[PDB]
Amino acid sequence: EIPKDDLDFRLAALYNHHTGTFKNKSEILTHQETINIRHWINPKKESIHSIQGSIVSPHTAATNGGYSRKNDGGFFS
Amino acid sequence: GCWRELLRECKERDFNKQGEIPGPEFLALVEKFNLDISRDECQQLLIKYDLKNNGKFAYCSFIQSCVLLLKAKETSLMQRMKIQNANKMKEAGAETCSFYSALLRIQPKIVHCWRPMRRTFKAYDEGGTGLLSVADFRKVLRQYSINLSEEEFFHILEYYDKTLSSKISYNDFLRAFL
Amino acid sequence: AVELELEAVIGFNGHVPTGLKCHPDQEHLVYPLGCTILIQAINTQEQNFLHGHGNNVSCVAISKSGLYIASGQVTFMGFKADIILWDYKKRELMARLSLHKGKIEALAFSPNDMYLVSLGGPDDGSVVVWSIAKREAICGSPAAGLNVGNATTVIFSKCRDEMFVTAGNGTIRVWELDLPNRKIWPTECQTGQMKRIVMSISMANDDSFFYLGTTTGDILKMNPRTKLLADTGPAKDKFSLGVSAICCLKMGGLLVGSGDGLLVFCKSPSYKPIKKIQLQGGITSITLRGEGHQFFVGTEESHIYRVNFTNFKETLITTCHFESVEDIVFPFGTAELFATCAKKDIRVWHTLTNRELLRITVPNMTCHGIDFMRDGKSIISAWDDGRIRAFAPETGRLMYVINNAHRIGVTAIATTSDCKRVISGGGEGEVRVWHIGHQTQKLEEALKEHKSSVSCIRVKKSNEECVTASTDGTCIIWDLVRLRRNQMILANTLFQCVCYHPEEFQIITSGTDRKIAYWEVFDGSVIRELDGSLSGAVNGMDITVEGVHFVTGGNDHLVKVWDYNEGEVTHVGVGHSGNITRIRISPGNQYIVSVSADGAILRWKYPFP
Numbered sequence: 001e002i003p004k005d006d007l008d009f010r011l012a013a014l015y016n017h018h019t020g021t022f023k024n025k026s027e028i029l030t031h032q033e034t035i036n037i038r039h040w041i042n043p044k045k046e047s048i049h050s051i052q053g054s055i056v057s058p059h060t061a062a063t064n065g066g067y068s069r070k071n072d073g074g075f076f077s
Numbered sequence: 078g079c080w081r082e083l084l085r086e087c088k089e090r091d092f093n094k095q096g097e098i099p100g101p102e103f104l105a106l107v108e109k110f111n112l113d114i115s116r117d118e119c120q121q122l123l124i125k126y127d128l129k130n131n132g133k134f135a136y137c138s139f140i141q142s143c144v145l146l147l148k149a150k151e152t153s154l155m156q157r158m159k160i161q162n163a164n165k166m167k168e169a170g171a172e173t174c175s176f177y178s179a180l181l182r183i184q185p186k187i188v189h190c191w192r193p194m195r196r197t198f199k200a201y202d203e204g205g206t207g208l209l210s211v212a213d214f215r216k217v218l219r220q221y222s223i224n225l226s227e228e229e230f231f232h233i234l235e236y237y238d239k240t241l242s243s244k245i246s247y248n249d250f251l252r253a254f255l
Numbered sequence: 256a257v258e259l260e261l262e263a264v265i266g267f268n269g270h271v272p273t274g275l276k277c278h279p280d281q282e283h284l285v286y287p288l289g290c291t292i293l294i295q296a297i298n299t300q301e302q303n304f305l306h307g308h309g310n311n312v313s314c315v316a317i318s319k320s321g322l323y324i325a326s327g328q329v330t331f332m333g334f335k336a337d338i339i340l341w342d343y344k345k346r347e348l349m350a351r352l353s354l355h356k357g358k359i360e361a362l363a364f365s366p367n368d369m370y371l372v373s374l375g376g377p378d379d380g381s382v383v384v385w386s387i388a389k390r391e392a393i394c395g396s397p398a399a400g401l402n403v404g405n406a407t408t409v410i411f412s413k414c415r416d417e418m419f420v421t422a423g424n425g426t427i428r429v430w431e432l433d434l435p436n437r438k439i440w441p442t443e444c445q446t447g448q449m450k451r452i453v454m455s456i457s458m459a460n461d462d463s464f465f466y467l468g469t470t471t472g473d474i475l476k477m478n479p480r481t482k483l484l485a486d487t488g489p490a491k492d493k494f495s496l497g498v499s500a501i502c503c504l505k506m507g508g509l510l511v512g513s514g515d516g517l518l519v520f521c522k523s524p525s526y527k528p529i530k531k532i533q534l535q536g537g538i539t540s541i542t543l544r545g546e547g548h549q550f551f552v553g554t555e556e557s558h559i560y561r562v563n564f565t566n567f568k569e570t571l572i573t574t575c576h577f578e579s580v581e582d583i584v585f586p587f588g589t590a591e592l593f594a595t596c597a598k599k600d601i602r603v604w605h606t607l608t609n610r611e612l613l614r615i616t617v618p619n620m621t622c623h624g625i626d627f628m629r630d631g632k633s634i635i636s637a638w639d640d641g642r643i644r645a646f647a648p649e650t651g652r653l654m655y656v657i658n659n660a661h662r663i664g665v666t667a668i669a670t671t672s673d674c675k676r677v678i679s680g681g682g683e684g685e686v687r688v689w690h691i692g693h694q695t696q697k698l699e700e701a702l703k704e705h706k707s708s709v710s711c712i713r714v715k716k717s718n719e720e721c722v723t724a725s726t727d728g729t730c731i732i733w734d735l736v737r738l739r740r741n742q743m744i745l746a747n748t749l750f751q752c753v754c755y756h757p758e759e760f761q762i763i764t765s766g767t768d769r770k771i772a773y774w775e776v777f778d779g780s781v782i783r784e785l786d787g788s789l790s791g792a793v794n795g796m797d798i799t800v801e802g803v804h805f806v807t808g809g810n811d812h813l814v815k816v817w818d819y820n821e822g823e824v825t826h827v828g829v830g831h832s833g834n835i836t837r838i839r840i841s842p843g844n845q846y847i848v849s850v851s852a853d854g855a856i857l858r859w860k861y862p863f864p
Contacts (some may be wrong), residue, residue, distance in 0.1 A: 046640070053661070214563060
């Protein structure tokens with residue numbers, strides 16, 4: 001990676017010139033080359049009490065006969 | 078002297094691990110390996126040694142008495158001994174059949190490598206005492222290719238550590254091999 | 256009517272307090288299930304689960320001798336909750352003890368058996384003392400002090416006559432039994448100012464002290480002799496949720512488990528986390544295997560752990576749901592995977608080793624049904640919020656969402672082979688076909704006949720028709736080139752599931768009249784009416800490819816292999832009495848997998864009819 005001696009001294013040498021007190025020649029030019037179940041969770045953590053939709057009925061599905069009574073009769077949803 | 082043969086030709090007919098095998102399936106098959114036999118020995122060694130009130134005979138206890146020491150009689154004086162730093166264990170024991178099976182499986186390895194094994198027991202956190210930790214015990218055992226499973230280590234540690242003290246004597250463990 | 260082998264059962268009910276126990280010869284594990292009690296060894300063999308109680312279990316207890324196992328069940332309001340004694344040499348019913356109203360919160364044995372104590376009834380709080388020598392009732396009293404509140408658990412000392420009930424709302428009482436007078440003597444424990452609610456209990460080996468696991472997050476050490484407070488728990492860094500699993504050791508140490516997954520090894524005078532590990536779910540049961548070197552952890556969601564005492568390494572060994580499961584769906588072709596759905600969870604399981612590969616979660620919701628596609632690109636799911644969500648087969652990424660699919664939650668679901676059309680049915684009664692594109696997801700037409708929620712919808716191999724079933728008693732044969740109805744299927748039964756016969760000439764139905772009925776595709780006339788269970792209902796249907804094998808899952812513990820031409824049964828379901836809602840068969844004709852209204856899944860072996 002180094003086509004020149006200057007890049008050999010620079011870049012890949014780890015010698016910090018500010019915090020390096022009194023290193024010798026052999027330690028300036030030291031190189032870097034010398035050295036289960038997966039879970040997915042919905043982010044929006046919504047409520048059972050935040051459901052959009054119809055109003056559920058107090059009576060059962062097959063028994064809405066004596067209460068439904070659309071003015072002049074008639075079964076509801 | 079034929080302990081590997083009487084184990085290999087008893088674990089095959091074992092239906093499910095702990096399950097022992099009934100009477101004649103032992104008496105006829107000690108003639109398979111030509112053990113010295115006598116009916117007077119056979120009666121007590123079968124009926125007296127059936128320690129679950131069934132026809133099956135406990136193989137592990139009998140061959141445990143055969144090959145593994147676990148109880149020294151000091152073998153009279155003027156007789157050179159091997160393990161020298163024992164009797165530092167505060168009378169622990171459960172002695173399950175699986176403990177004996179684990180001991181028997183580990184047996185051929187320890188006798189080959191115990192002169193260097195004891196010194197790596199020593200150099201790893203002794204000082205002079207005679208007590209190592211459980212984790213260091215597992216590390217020392219693995220370095221000589223003795224690999225113990227979770228069930229095996231549970232049954233090992235239930236005999237040499239009763240108070241859950243996480244300290245295990247290594248000489249007393251090595252005493253029941255030589 | 257031969258009985259074929261049940262290969263494995265996967266369920267676990269960690270919702271009960273101290274449900275998981277270990278019995279003291281060190282090979283088996285006892286944890287309850289929806290209706291039975293499971294026993295698991297080291298080798299993966301299910302050893303004869305205990306049938307009884309006619310309803311859900313509530314609590315478990317075991318003897319120190321290893322000879323007797325106790326269990327309690329729940330019953331209706333104003334009815335008897337029966338305590339069943341069990342033996343272990345021959346695992347059968349020994350006695351039926353019935354002196355409670357409602358449920359049974361806790362049971363406890365004396366160290367050398369004989370006596371049995373049963374704190375039960377959140378409404379009728381009382382304690383009776385049994386014997387197992389003679390199975391009568393000795394003596395009892397209202398075991399909750401007036402102007403205080405209720406009581407939760409019990410435990411036994413080493414004196415055969417001193418028991419002690421747990422403060423449901425502030426009544427800590429150490430009891431004493433008098434044999435000749437046939438009385439029990441209550442003694443209140445005097446606490447200074449702390450009024451605590453305690454759910455978990457423990458006792459030391461030599462009866463020196465007993466501990467309490469309170470709601471607030473502290474552990475109260477108490478002395479049974481002087482009946483006075485001994486020590487108070489940690490003041491800094493208190494445990495988060497209510498301690499629901501506390502166990503003691505041979506030394507003064509104790510294994511305390513919190514409700515957020517904090518299994519902590521702690522100390523007696525000043526409680527500190529010497530060693531702790533974090534687990535999934537609130538820990539509900541801690542039991543020592545043989546002496547302490549290994550032990551077992553039960554969690555709120557069904558996990559079972561095995562963690563060694565030295566340096567605390569855990570191993571997850573069992574996973575399951577924690578609610579009613581429905582609508583297992585097999586992938587096409589391969590048979591070594593299958594998928595499930597329940598409340599808040601959709602999980603895909605390996606079927607050879609019965610383990611879990613992934614889970615996807617939408618919290619606080621329940622999944623009514625799922626389905627795959629022809630090639631494994633997505634899992635469409637019918638949640639209860641009126642939404643249809645599609646996830647990737649692995650890593651669970653949300654592909655898209657259909658926002659307002661129905662006015663109530665989508666109940667049924669289907670899939671066409673061309674990966675273009677998804678048929679869905681809501682609780683309002685609408686059957687809706689949806690167009691799935693590469694970028695957009697549209698609605699071509701909502702088809703409108705049903706007057707109740709849609710139970711199940713099945714399509715033919717040619718993506719041209721579909722049958723939709725509903726609980727109003729109508730099954731409608733729709734088309735797909737046009738979107739219209741052809742003929743009605745009217746009966747006196749609330750339908751639950753429908754199934755296409757291969758060669759597409761007959762259609763079978765079911766419901767809650769215990770009559771499997773054959774119908775024609777056109778003219779809608781009846782052909783034959785079979786018998787389902789003679790007691791309950793019929794809920795799960797499946798027919799294999801060859802068309803002669805056909806599986807019925809009733810409301811009872813029975814799965815029944817039926818002959819298609821005759822009425823012939825090959826009775827296999829000696830399993831779990833939880834309500835078998837949906838059922839499915841293997842594509843390669845190898846397995847029969849069924850689900851239940853509790854957190855259970857059963858996997859049977861395929862016979863040839």
